[PDB]
Amino acid sequence: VVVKKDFRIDLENELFIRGEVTLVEDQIKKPVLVISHGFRGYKDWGFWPYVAAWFAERGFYVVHFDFSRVGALNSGADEASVQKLSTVSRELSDLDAILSNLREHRLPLAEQAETERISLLGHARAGGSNIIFAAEHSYIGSVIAWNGGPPPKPNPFINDDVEHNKQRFDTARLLASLTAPVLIIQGGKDREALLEGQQLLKEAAPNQTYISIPDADHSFGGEHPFHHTTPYLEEALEVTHSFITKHYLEH
């Protein structure tokens, strides 16, 4: 009943993105959820296959994908090559490619995607990058960060990138002004630096929604490999799904 369709977007040079559309086919347009994996992840990592299917069963047209850096590394690209593809800027560029292909209806089964109702879900570092993309694109109607969100902070490319985009990447400023519904879910058993940044977000932008799951770690327990769900991932899923469905279209 859940259909999974592979796609590949060939980018410039040898860069490419492998992704999946996950969907229960009902011949109607379904709200879109585009999922971004974290810095240590990939589309087949940990809970992502489960999460993609979970949302497809709940009525979403789901896209998840390997960032460019992942396809480069599996192609055996140089260490400098992979490092420069690892910037936040490159996430935003990859995400722009994913969303352009969705909006031009080039992804599989795109006739069943409601591009008028697009949401982002970002894990860890991609929680900050998804907030940035959301803030910069009117067609993103809501964004959810899992154990991420605060501004992105051995890679010299990441240093140059963070240095040249100190204002653009300030998710604290962006969240204070973004009128779209944003949800940040944070596990209590994550590193303190992150938890500190999450309080600064909540103080900067109280208008948004902040959910803490005290006993959950940085992955809600769903690190690789994934044999079963956990209470914490299940909560994050139900809260995220309630957030999108109950608030997306509200004024």
For 46, the token pair is 């940990």
Locate the DSSP E strands across 56-208: 61-65, 113-123, 140-146, 182-187
Cα gap 155→162, rounded to integer Å: 11
Cited resolution, angstroms: 2.4
Name the method of structure determination: X-ray
Q: Residue 129: which residues within 8 A CB-CB, separation 6 or more?
A: 36, 88, 91, 92, 95, 122, 152
Listed residue (182, 87, 73) closest to 127, CA to CA: 182
Listed residue (94, 90, 85, 84) closest to 35, CA to CA: 94
Q: How far is CA 148 from the centre of its chain?
A: 10
Q: Residue 120: which residues within 8 A CB-CB, separation 6 or more?
A: 33, 34, 36, 130, 133, 134, 140, 142, 143, 144
Q: Residue 187: which residues within 8 A CB-CB, separation 6 or more?
A: 147, 212, 213, 214, 215, 216, 217, 218, 220, 232
* Torsion angle defined by CA atoms of residues 175, 181, 186 and 192, in that order, rounded to the nearest 10 degrees: 10
Q: How many distinct structural domains can be found in the chain? A: 1
* CATH code: domain of residue 38: 3.40.50.1820
Q: Roughly what angle, to the nearest 10 degrees, separates helices 156-164 and 88-103?
A: 70
For 169, the token pair is 């990447």
DSSP string, 99-140: HHHHHTT-STTGGGEEEEEEEEEEETHHHHHHHHHHHT-TTE
Q: How far is CA 36 from CA 44, 67, 196, 199, in A?
A: 12, 8, 23, 23
Q: How far is CA 126 from the centre of its chain?
A: 5
Range of the domain at 20: 2-248
189: helix, strand or coil: coil
Radius of gyration over alpha carbons of the chain, in Å?
A: 17
* Ramachandran region, residue 216 (left: φ > 0; alpha: ψ -120 to 50; beta: rest): beta
